[PDB]
Every structure is written in structure tokens, then in C-alpha cells.
Amino acid sequence: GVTTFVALYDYVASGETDLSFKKGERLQIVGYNHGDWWLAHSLTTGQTGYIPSNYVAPSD
Amino acid sequence: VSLARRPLPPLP
């Protein structure tokens, strides 16, 4: 039920829906999410997009 | 709905 995640790896998004992010970035999940890819907002860069859940872990 | 349910990328 945590909403804040940290990026565990750098990720280059392939599509316009997805967020690129770098290892260590703090990401907050936005709205209702299900499945494997979740809409997120980077607290580090301000960008938004879908993230792959296997690239992140719950964070403070 | 499809955007959430897409295959994941492999880990690096």
C-alpha cells in the first residue's frame, strides 16, 4: 500500500507513455494502478509516465 | 488497461 518507490536501475523508455528514470530516483505512483506497469511521477526530475514494476522497490 | 498489462522489460 506504499506509494513511493526507488528506481533500482536506469531505464530508457521505448514509448511516449513510459517514464525514463535513473537508478536512485524516487518515484511516486499516481492514481489507480494494476498489472505490471504503473503510472508514476519522478520526485527527482518532475517527469511522469508508466514505469515497469520490476525496476523499482518500495521506499520512504 | 493494456498499458498496465504489457510485458515487462528484462532486468539489466
Side-chain angles (χ1 to χ4, degrees):
Chain A
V2 166
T3 71
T4 40
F5 294 80
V6 62
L8 300 170
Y9 307 106
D10 292 343
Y11 180 69
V12 175
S14 45
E16 55 170 29
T17 61
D18 300 341
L19 179 56
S20 289
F21 54 84
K22 351 171 211 26
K23 185 186 201 296
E25 263 185 70
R26 277 176 75 252
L27 307 174
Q28 185 147 219
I29 297 321
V30 174
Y32 174 81
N33 289 287
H34 66 290
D36 282 336
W37 293 78
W38 303 337
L39 183 66
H41 172 233
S42 175
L43 304 177
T44 309
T45 68
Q47 313 294 308
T48 62
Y50 276 85
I51 61 174
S53 57
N54 60 333
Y55 276 58
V56 303
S59 177
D60 58 304
Chain B
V1 160
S2 63
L3 297 178
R5 284 163 164 160
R6 289 173 290 166
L8 284 169
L11 293 177

